[PDB]
Amino acid sequence: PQITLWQRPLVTIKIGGQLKEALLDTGADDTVLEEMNLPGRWKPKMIGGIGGFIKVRQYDQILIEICGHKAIGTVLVGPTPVNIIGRNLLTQIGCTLNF
Amino acid sequence: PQITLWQRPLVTIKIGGQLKEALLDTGADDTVLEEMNLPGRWKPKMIGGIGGFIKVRQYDQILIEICGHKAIGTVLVGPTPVNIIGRNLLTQIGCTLNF
Numbered sequence: 002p003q004i005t006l007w008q009r010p011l012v013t014i015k016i017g018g019q020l021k022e023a024l025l026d027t028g029a030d031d032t033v034l035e036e037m038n039l040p041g042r043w044k045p046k047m048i049g050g051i052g053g054f055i056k057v058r059q060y061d062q063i064l065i066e067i068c069g070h071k072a073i074g075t076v077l078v079g080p081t082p083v084n085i086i087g088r089n090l091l092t093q094i095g096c097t098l099n100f
Numbered sequence: 101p102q103i104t105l106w107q108r109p110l111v112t113i114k115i116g117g118q119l120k121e122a123l124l125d126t127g128a129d130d131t132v133l134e135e136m137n138l139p140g141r142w143k144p145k146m147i148g149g150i151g152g153f154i155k156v157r158q159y160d161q162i163l164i165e166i167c168g169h170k171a172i173g174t175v176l177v178g179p180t181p182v183n184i185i186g187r188n189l190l191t192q193i194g195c196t197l198n199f
């Protein structure tokens with residue numbers, strides 16, 4: 002699809018068999034979701050935002066469907082203001098910016 | 101152009117007679133630049149995201165050239181870690197997300 006930016010680019014994602022709403026964010030290097038349960042082991046990660054840095058949990062090789070497109074990659078979990086899909090997964094779904 | 105997301109989508113901008121590098125950020129509602137002087141009236145604003153909030157100066161009706169495309173809009177100035185071009189100006193240059 003082609004998504005204009007007059008409104009926030011919010012889409013439905015599916016992770017762990019559940020639907021969630023998430024923002025397609027070209028300004029984010031990584032994908033960070035609000036507190037949730039994910040399988041396996043996690044590693045520590047610090048991510049920097051507009052207000053400073055936060056600690057998150059890094060889970061690797063996680064299945065996630067974004068706007069119907071399947072991806073398998075790194076998902077961070079922590080106190081983000083909104084669920085964010087970052088460039089690590091936008092590249093998997095073949096997303097580009099165009100003007 | 102078609103901008104890949106393999107790397108951060110950094111482009112050259114021209115504002116207040118200054119050439120700067122800025123990030124095309126679909127996850128940003130507003131445009132926020134690192135400290136600089138801008139003409140006209142301003143009002144304070146708080147913007148928030150990962151790590152919390154920062155205080156910025158809000159300038160309206162500011163002319164900006166983004167990767168050769170002219171746009172006018174509100175520009176926020178403050179302690180952002182990177183210059184961000186948000187949706188308020190991405191729409192003006194006809195920027196869309198495609199996959």
Ligand SMILES: COC(=O)N[C@H](C(=O)Nc1ccccc1CC[C@@H](CO)NCc1ccc(N)cc1)C(c1ccccc1)c1ccccc1
Nearest residue numbers: 026028029030031033048049050051127128148149181182
């Ligand atoms: C050390 O930092 C880095 O290595 N990368 C930074 C990075 O990618 N952060 C990151 C990582 C995972 C998930 C989300 C984000 C930022 C979400 C932003 C992007 O959308 N929301 C902005 C926003 C949205 C809404 C509101 N209301 C307010 C703000 C990056 C940057 C930081 C701040 C702002 C823009 C980019 C960065 C890039 C280059 C140089 C330094 C930092």
Ligand SMILES: [Cl-]
Nearest residue numbers: 050051149150
């Ligand atoms: Cl942020």
Ligand SMILES: [Cl-]
Nearest residue numbers: 074075089090
């Ligand atoms: Cl990944």
Ligand SMILES: [Cl-]
Nearest residue numbers: 172173174188
């Ligand atoms: Cl505006």
Ligand SMILES: [Cl-]
Nearest residue numbers: 005006191194
């Ligand atoms: Cl349009």
